[PDB]
Write an enzyme that holds these catalytic residues in place. Structure first.
Site, short mmCIF file in Angstrom:
data_model
loop_
_atom_site.label_atom_id
_atom_site.label_comp_id
_atom_site.label_asym_id
_atom_site.label_seq_id
_atom_site.Cartn_x
_atom_site.Cartn_y
_atom_site.Cartn_z
CB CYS A 143 -0.97 0.00 1.17
SG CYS A 143 -0.22 -0.13 2.80
CG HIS A 182 -4.91 -0.21 3.66
ND1 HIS A 182 -4.00 -0.67 2.74
CD2 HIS A 182 -5.99 0.18 2.94
CE1 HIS A 182 -4.50 -0.56 1.52
NE2 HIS A 182 -5.71 -0.04 1.62
CB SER A 224 -5.65 -3.49 -0.69
OG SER A 224 -6.06 -4.33 0.36
#
Ligand SMILES: [Cl-]
Lengths: 248, 49
Positions: free
Chosen positions: A112, A147, A164
Site C-alpha cells: 500500500c 493500511h 491491497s
C-alpha cells in the site's frame, strides 16, 4: 536492513538474496520446496516491464486516474514476504519522488505505501487533481493493522488510488460527493472482512512540486473512531475537507 | 577497457533473473494464500437443514 543497501536497485548481493529465500522457507509450509523449483528452473516466464502511462493533452483526469491505477496494479501486490523498497515517511518529498522513479524502473511488486508514493509521483502533472493520504488503523484478532491509500479530489468529487489484496480497499473512481462517503466506502470494506476500524489519519493535500523539500503531513487530522460520535466523526471529516479546500 | 561492457551485460542478465524469480515467487505465494484461505472456508461451511 533495507533490501537495497547496495544502493541503486537490482541485482542485490547474495547476503540479501539468501535472506529473502530463508524468509520464504519460514512463512510457507513447504518452505524450501517452492524455492527449489524457482531457483532451480533453467527458464522462467518473462515478465514485461510495465510502461508508465502517457496521455493526450486533452485526456480527462478520470481517464488518467484509471490508467495510473492500472499501471500500479500491473506491478502486482507483493506476496513475497520481503519489502523491496525502503520508504521513510518523514523524508523530503523530492527524495520520495526519486524513490518512485526507481520503483518504475526496477518494476517489482509493491504494497500500500509504495502505491501511495507512486500515486503522488504519477499525478504531480495533474494540477487540477488534489492528492492526500488516508491511513486506517484497524483491529482484527489480537492484532492491529495499518493500511494507507492516496485519496484524490477532482472537480469536487473524491476517489482514491492504492494497492491491497482486496479490490474494495484501493481504487475508487472520483465519484464520491463527500469525503465522509469515500471514507465510509472503506469502512464498509473493513466491515465485510471483520476488521474493527480504530483510527483514520488524513494528511494535507500534497504539493505537486516534484522538487519540494517539505515532508508529507501524514496526520493533519487523526480521528479516534471509538471516542468520536458517528456524527462528530462525520463533522471531523468535513472539517478536514474544508481545511483542505482553503489551502487550495 | 571493455570490462565495463561485459560487467554491465552481466549485471543486466542477473537483474533480469532476480526479477523473474521474484515474480515466480510472487505467483506461488499468491496461490498458497488462496489455497490456505479456501481450506479455511471449506472447514466452516454450514450444514444447513
Ligand atoms: Cl482500474
Amino acid at each position: 536492513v533495507p533490501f537495497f543497501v547496495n544502493r541503486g536497485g537490482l541485482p542485490v548481493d547474495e547476503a540479501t538474496w539468501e535472506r529473502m529465500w530463508k524468509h520464504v522457507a519460514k512463512i510457507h509450509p513447504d518452505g524450501e520446496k517452492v524455492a527449489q523449483r524457482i531457483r532451480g528452473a533453467t527458464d522462467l516466464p518473462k515478465i514485461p516491464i510495465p510502461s508508465v502511462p502517457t496521455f493526450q493533452p486533452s485526456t480527462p483526469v478520470p481517464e488518467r486516474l484509471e490508467a495510473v491505477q492500472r499501471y500500479i496494479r500491473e506491478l502486482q501486490y507483493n506476496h513475497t514476504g520481503t519489502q523491496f523498497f525502503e520508504i521513510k515517511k518523514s523524508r523530503p518529498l523530492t527524495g520520495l519522488m526519486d524513490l518512485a522513479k526507481e520503483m518504475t524502473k526496477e518494476a517489482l511488486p509493491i504494497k500500500c505505501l509504495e502505491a501511495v508514493i507512486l500515486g503522488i509521483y504519477l499525478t504531480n502533472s495533474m494540477p487540477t487533481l488534489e492528492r492526500f493520504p488516508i491511513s486506517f488503523k484497524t483491529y482484527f484478532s489480537g492484532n492491529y493493522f495499518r493500511h494507507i491509500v492516496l485519496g484524490v479530489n477532482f472537480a469536487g468529487r473524491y476517489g482514491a488510488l492504492g494497492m491491497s489484496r482486496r479490490e474494495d480497499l484501493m481504487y475508487k473512481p472520483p465519484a464520491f460527493r463527500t469525503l465522509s462517503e469515500l471514507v465510509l466506502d472503506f469502512e464498509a470494506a473493513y466491515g465485510r472482512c471483520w476488521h474493527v476500524l480504530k483510527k483514520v489519519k488524513l494528511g494535507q493535500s500534497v504539493s505537486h512540486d516534484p522538487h519540494s523539500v517539505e515532508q508529507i503531513e501524514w496526520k493533519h487530522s487523526v480521528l479516534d473512531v471509538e471516542r468520536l460520535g458517528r456524527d462528530d466523526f462525520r463533522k471531523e471529516l468535513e472539517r478536514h475537507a474544508r481545511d483542505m479546500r482553503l489551502k487550495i | 577497457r571493455v570490462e565495463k561492457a561485459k560487467q554491465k551485460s552481466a549485471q543486466q542478465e542477473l537483474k533480469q533473473r532476480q526479477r523473474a524469480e521474484i515474480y515466480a515467487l510472487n505467483r506461488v505465494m499468491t496461490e498458497l494464500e488462496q489455497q490456505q484461505f479456501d481450506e479455511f472456508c471449506k472447514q466452516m461451511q454450514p450444514p444447513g437443514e
